[PDB]
Design a binder for this molecule. Structure first.
Ligand SMILES: CC(C)=CCC/C(C)=C/CC/C(C)=C/CONC(=O)CP(=O)(O)O
Ligand SMILES: O=S(=O)(O)C[C@H](O)CNC1CCCCC1
Ligand SMILES: O=S(=O)(O)C[C@H](O)CNC1CCCCC1
Ligand SMILES: [Zn+2]
Lengths: 315, 482, 6
């Protein structure tokens, strides 16, 4: 049985303020008694700008009912800082909250603000939590975005050691071993190996990277993630396509294809895209046009128009 | 060059003998969609098999679905209490596309509800101004909804928006971060959704200044990934030494980034906007169209699942990327760029709720229809049905008719020198921005209506996602070009 | 597993 806040002694001094929809509003939501009452009192709290423990409690009650309520999240963080509350306690409360609300923009941003403010000398514990939180959904977009921010923010402060970067690549390698079709982990590899400011670029690091990419393609020839990564890699480092061509030619019918795995129908459309682009690199515009037309006519007919556009580009 | 799904061989994505969780979900989705296509008459056929479902757009069912959601929502919609202007926009834009008119009384209610979401300090929130703080996304949704349901009378709401121009601009400036990003609200997250929603509103309301736009182009450009699409955000390493993209290329963020960049191309600032790789964005765009077995719907990210809402996010980004590609090739010196037929087939066969039920459109079979998917399925269907181009001769024609002596008062910049250098620069800026905003046309003879003309919906505008017949009078009002 | 934009 719900006890209204107008009957609670701790709220006696507070006059609730009603929602100001105006006359006959469109898209009205039929709120529960609990939610209407909580918001009636939140309106009064926010209006008077009260920063108190009872206000903090009320914000929790509300975000539990609506984890997307950005106004209430904003007010909650404002209370935390104002009252000099334990930010570590709040982060622990968010551990449960975040798992149940993976797609909530404001839950994930609340974590970010907390980590930014706590500003630990070593963020290792948060890194580990984040890795764990990816178990129920290895592709949760906000989580991957948050992981990127964490490493970028804390590396700027000089707080990510070489051991930390090393174990992060190890974890990323494991993610792609468990599911090589996880595009989110491929994206993270690109950050770790290519885009981050502190990434090593040597002729030997390029060699290793090519080996990893090629091995990945040979293991899963129809994996678009691996193909896109290869194309980005060569483009970013201005590397010619031709010298790698031997490793890719078999799919158009350094690590080489298997002596081919079962369930691998040929040709692989993106292998033909590679071959056509390699012809372009060689000034062989007619040979590229023929490959593009074949992609358009036979091998990737969903993209018939795009491949035709690419064919006309040669002619 | 736009083959029907029914005319192509349907094959599962090959396993390569390496199973994974991704492939498990993919195979499951392939079965689900292909089974529904098998039970449905080919929309292109004059003679259908007996007993097969008719794929015709069930416009009256979708109207009724939107009606029920429109006047009262169940208690579980509380999860969208901070998104009420989106519920308005998804409803009123869908009704526009479906060709269903609201009476003046209902329009007045829409306007009045939204005006209660407007704070005097500036901007719209997800609910009443006494309950919620302003947010860039509800500001976009409310402004577009006012374009759809409002008018120039004292009760039409456009008058109120005009008066709110300075305060909205000030809210935009409070959101501004030095690296070119914007917070979505006070203390809020920074990504391209914010940039998109802000630029649309600033364009329509004539509140664009140099100080508003500084670095905005750079933030967006650095969101582009090695895949060719755009991520949510870019991180500035300490004006910044470099900028690095923060996650995967996604349809939602690629739509927002392409649209943002496109809006910036009409701003006459020096070396602005910083270029994007248009060819790579087009490549990413076309690669997200699903195979015949999955109905030719768009997915939002590599190795994820097709989803009706990406018909708008990915499909509606196609004309934008195409135009950017066209301009890039012109700077050095025609078949459809995606399968316009297949996308309509996905919409009609897979994305509609089963007949004789609640109506509405959905993510995929097995998913409940909602307002969001109703709006974005239909917005995407429109892009597929109607060949949209940005026309240089239309822009030129717009320039010729522009009256620079007519306009609302200039915005007062936050920084003393944050405005345009002088009136010539400012008026040239107003002309370019207005002229290009009204540059999108439907190409006559470009129309493809799968299943017959009764499936035809109205024509949405790329970038803005409102009908041209709404956009023109709305932007003409704020620029005083009526 | 709904879609979330805000
Ligand atoms: C307010 C605007 C204009 C938003 C952009 C629209 C979209 C679709 C944004 C996407 C946000 C996102 C990446 C959410 C993460 O959760 N969503 C998914 O995982 C869906 P999928 O599996 O298709 O990536
Ligand atoms: O057109 S829709 O597919 O949206 C639904 C529309 O209500 C079909 N109902 C007919 C109407 C005539 C007699 C009863 C059956
Ligand atoms: O495309 S045309 O205009 O030549 C043909 C017309 O649109 C077909 N619509 C049918 C008519 C019968 C009920 C089901 C929908
Ligand atoms: Zn969706």
């Amino acid at each position: 049985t719900y006890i209204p806040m107008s009957q609670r002694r701790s709220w006696a001094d507070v006059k609730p303020i009603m929602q100001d929809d105006g006359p006959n509003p469109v898209v009205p939501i039929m709120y529960s008694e609990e939610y209407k009452d909580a918001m009636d009192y939140f309106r009064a709290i926010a209006a008077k700008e009260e920063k108190s423990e009872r206000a903090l409690e009320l914000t929790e009650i509300i975000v539990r009912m609506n984890p997307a309520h950005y106004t209430v999240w904003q007010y909650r963080f404002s209370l935390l800082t104002s009252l000099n509350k334990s930010l570590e306690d709040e982060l622990r409360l968010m551990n449960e909250f975040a798992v149940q609300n993976l797609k909530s923009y404001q839950v994930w941003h609340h974590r970010l603000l907390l980590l930014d403010r706590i500003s630990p000398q070593d963020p290792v514990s948060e890194i580990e939590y984040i890795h764990g939180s990816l178990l129920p959904d290895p592709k949760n977009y906000h989580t991957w975005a948050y992981l990127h921010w964490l490493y970028s923010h804390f590396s700027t402060l000089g707080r990510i050691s070489e051991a930390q970067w090393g174990s992060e690549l190890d974890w990323c390698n494991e993610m792609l071993r468990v599911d090589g079709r996880n595009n989110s982990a491929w994206g993270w590899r690109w950050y770790l190996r290519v885009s981050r400011p502190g990434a090593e670029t040597s002729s030997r690091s390029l060699q290793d990277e090519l080996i990893y990419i090629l091995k990945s393609i040979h293991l899963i020839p129809h994996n678009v993630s691996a193909w896109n990564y290869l194309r980005g890699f060569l483009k970013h480092f201005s590397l010619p396509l031709v010298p790698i061509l031997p490793a890719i030619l078999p799919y158009t019918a350094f690590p080489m294809p298997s002596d081919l795995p079962e369930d691998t129908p040929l040709p692989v459309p993106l292998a033909l895209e590679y071959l056509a682009d390699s012809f372009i690199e060689q000034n062989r515009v007619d040979d590229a046009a023929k490959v593009f037309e074949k992609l358009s006519s036979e091998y990737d007919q969903m993209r018939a128009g795009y491949w035709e556009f690419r064919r006309r580009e040669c002619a | 060059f736009t083959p029907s799904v029914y005319s192509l061989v349907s094959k599962p994505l090959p396993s390569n003998s390496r199973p994974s969780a991704t492939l498990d979900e993919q195979a499951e989705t392939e079965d689900l969609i292909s089974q529904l296509f098998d039970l449905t008459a080919d929309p292109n056929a004059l003679v259908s098999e007996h007993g097969k479902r008719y794929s015709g757009l069930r416009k009256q069912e979708h109207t009724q679905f939107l009606a029920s959601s429109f006047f009262q929502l169940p208690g579980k919609f509380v999860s969208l209490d901070a998104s009420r202007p989106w519920l308005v926009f998804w409803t009123v834009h869908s009704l526009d596309l479906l060709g269903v008119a609201l009476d003046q009384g209902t329009k007045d209610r829409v306007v009045s509800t939204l005006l209660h979401f407007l704070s005097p300090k500036g901007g719209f929130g997800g609910g009443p101004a006494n309950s919620q703080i302003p947010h860039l996304l509800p500001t976009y949704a409310s402004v577009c909804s006012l374009a759809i349901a409002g008018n120039d009378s004292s009760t039409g709401g456009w008058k109120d928006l005009a008066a709110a121009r300075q305060s909205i601009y000030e809210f935009f400036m409070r959101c501004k971060r030095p690296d070119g990003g914007f917070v979505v609200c006070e203390g809020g997250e920074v990504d391209v959704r914010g940039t998109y929603c802000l630029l649309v509103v600033a364009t329509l309301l004539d509140i664009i200044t140099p100080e508003l736009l500084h670095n905005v182009d750079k933030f967006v450009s650095a969101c582009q990934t090695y895949e060719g699409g755009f991520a949510c955000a870019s991180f500035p390493f300490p004006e910044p030494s470099c900028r690095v993209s923060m996650a995967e290329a996604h349809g939602g963020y690629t739509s927002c980034s392409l649209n943002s960049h496109f809006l910036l191309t009409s701003v006459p600032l020096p070396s602005f906007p910083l270029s994007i790789d248009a060819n790579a964005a087009l490549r990413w765009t076309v690669l997200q169209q699903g195979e015949p077995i999955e109905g030719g719907g768009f997915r939002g990210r590599t190795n994820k699942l097709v989803d009706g809402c990406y018909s708008w996010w990915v499909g509606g980004g196609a004309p934008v990327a195409e135009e950017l590609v066209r301009r890039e090739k012109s700077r050095k010196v025609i078949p459809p760029i995606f399968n316009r037929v297949a996308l309509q087939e996905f919409t009609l066969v897979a994305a509609q709720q089963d007949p004789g039920s609640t109506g509405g459109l959905r993510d995929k079979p097995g998913k409940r229809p909602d307002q969001y998917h109703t709006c974005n399925n239909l917005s995407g269907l429109s892009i597929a049905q109607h060949k949209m181009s940005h026309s240089p001769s239309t822009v030129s024609s717009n320039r010729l008719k522009f009256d620079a002596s007519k306009g609302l008062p200039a915005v007062k910049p936050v920084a003393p020198g944050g405005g345009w250098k002088n009136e010539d620069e400012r008026q040239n800026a107003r002309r370019e921005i207005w002229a290009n905003a009204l540059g999108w046309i439907e190409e006559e003879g470009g129309e493809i209506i799968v299943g017959g003309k009764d499936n035809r919906i109205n024509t949405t505008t790329p970038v803005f996602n409102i009908l041209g017949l709404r956009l023109k009078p709305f932007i003409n009002y704020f620029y005083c070009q009526e | 597993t709904k879609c979330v934009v805000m």
